[PDB]
Amino acid sequence: DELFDVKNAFYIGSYQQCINEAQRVKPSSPERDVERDVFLYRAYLAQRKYGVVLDEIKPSSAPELQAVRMFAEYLASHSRRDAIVAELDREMSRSVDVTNTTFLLMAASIYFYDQNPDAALRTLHQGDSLECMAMTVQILLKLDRLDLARKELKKMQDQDEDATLTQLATAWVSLAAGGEKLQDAYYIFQEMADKCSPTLLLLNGQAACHMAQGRWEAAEGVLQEALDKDSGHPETLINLVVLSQHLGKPPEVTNRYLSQLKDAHRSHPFIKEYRAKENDFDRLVLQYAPS
């Protein structure tokens, strides 16, 4: 595979590296050229550079790219979402293509965000790529069905025991299994960061594994390193909040991280949930409070 690095860089979370290599690569196949552009924009999407994708992917672009652009508008325009899912529903039923794996992945991605695991899963069930399996594993995990997740894992475990995609999938499953499996997860995240590079994604994976076991002090370093690369990185700030309280830091510390999160991403799901908790608490105060 000529796009091995490009894809790998993408999956482990170093998007700029993915974008840089994507451009250094030379087509050598109208197929490969499309595969490359697909990852190039998947990467810009990971960096939240929606405009770049929306502007550059035009109507005459390959259908694979169109799928990517579909996700891009869903991600960018909050209003256009129901209209997109609607068209996605129609395209998904009024037609039957499956050879286009990129479409399945993008479509499944939209369904994932639309909180419709069944549709995402139903879509992915039609695909046949190693990524389709990893995404299926992810969704099964969020559905708290570790059992179904283990099955999909072995499915991809038999197909490519050493693909970084299979290794990451195994780490997620291990993190979900708990106990001994936790150290397994830690090592794959550490090895990955060592071989490739210590991406914000991999750093937080390591930190999650350390904190799973009660090693709060060992998580300090990786979180420091991640924060030093991007203040405002969601996962890092959240984990810092959790970590601060376990290390006994001054309560203002936990709060600073919380505020820093609101600054960098006003509408992150974790911020929305926090707000929701504040709401039903006020609501519950009224429920118990004397009249």
Binding site: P117, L143, L201, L258, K277
Partner: protein, 320 residues
């Protein structure tokens, strides 16, 4: 058939709830209504307003996070305190607040008291008091320390609160002055630590001296000296005590008995002797005269004075 949509498994947070009866475990799980109910039944919390920051803050440390596939919603981790043996059914949340942390903060309260910042002292003190039911203690003695830690907090809260009021009352009438002396003498019975117990005895001595109630003053003087105050204070005290012996008699009869077991009304600041009827905060042990039953405790700020309860629950040990 082939594709069948799979059905949700049970979420880790739900597991925690199904697994514990400890308030903090439910707060950590985001189960506020459940947590509030536990706090309401075990202790008697009814006014959860001043518990907002504790909840949100506690809740914010409940789950870690990490990414899976790029561009998709991130994953949440739910660290367990029993991560080794916790199956996928027996997990219980990691512990993020311990008894030692609370005991440690007690020193800042002690500091504040000594330097006279009573108001800030009551806050820190109340803050610890409200935090005890949020612990996950291990052994039976650790449970006793928690109860004793709560006791210390209310003792100082009603003691200092009483004092700050006495300092507000007017000092014109003889009656107004008999009232101040009384309150000052009531403080004398709070169980603080020697350095503070001495500071309030020193105060009562002066008030009672000026009220020419020398016989009672001599007793305060003797209790102060036995506490071993700094040299200068001890000397002053011996001086006042010899003065009192020149006329060992109390001018006015006051509503205070130094030899009859008390219990200060945490709202009115008046004595409720030995077996008289009393209503107590189900959480702090604070005492109130029967009138106040059913009202929100002034010490706790969140508790209901009359309320019957199961009792503080901060350890699995407590569920035989």
């Amino acid at each position: 058939g082939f594709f069948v949509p799979p059905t949700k498994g049970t979420s880790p947070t739900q597991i925690w709830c199904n697994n514990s009866q400890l308030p903090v475990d439910h707060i950590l799980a985001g189960s506020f209504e459940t947590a509030m109910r536990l706090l309401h039944d075990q202790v008697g919390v009814t006014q959860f307003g001043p518990y907002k920051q504790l909840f949100l803050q506690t809740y914010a440390r409940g789950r870690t996070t990490y990414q899976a596939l790029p561009c998709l919603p991130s994953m949440y981790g739910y660290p367990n305190r029993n991560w080794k043996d916790a199956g996928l059914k027996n997990g219980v949340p990691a512990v993020g607040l311990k008894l030692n942390d609370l005991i440690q903060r007690l020193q800042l309260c002690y500091q504040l008291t000594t330097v006279g910042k009573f108001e800030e002292a009551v806050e820190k003190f109340r803050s610890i008091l409200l935090s005890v039911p949020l612990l996950v203690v291990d052994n039976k003695q650790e449970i006793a320390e928690a109860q004793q830690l709560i006791t210390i907090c209310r003792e100082y809260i009603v003691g200092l609160s009483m004092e700050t009021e006495r300092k507000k009352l007017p000092k014109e009438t003889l009656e107004q002055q008999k009232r101040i002396c009384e309150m000052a003498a009531y403080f004398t019975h709070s169980n603080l630590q020697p350095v503070h117990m001495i500071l309030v005895l020193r105060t009562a001595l002066n008030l009672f001296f000026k009220l020419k109630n020398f016989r009672t003053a001599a007793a305060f003087a003797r209790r102060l000296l036995e506490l071993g105050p700094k040299p200068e204070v001890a000397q002053q005290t011996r001086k006042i005590l010899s003065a009192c012996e020149k006329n060992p008699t109390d001018a006015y009869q006051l509503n205070y008995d130094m030899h009859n077991p008390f219990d200060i009304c945490a709202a009115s600041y008046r004595p409720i002797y030995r077996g008289k009827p009393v209503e107590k905060c189900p959480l702090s042990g604070a005492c109130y005269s029967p009138e106040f039953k059913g009202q929100i405790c002034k010490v706790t700020t969140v508790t209901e004075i009359g309320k019957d309860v199961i009792g503080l629950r901060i350890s699995p040990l407590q569920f035989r």
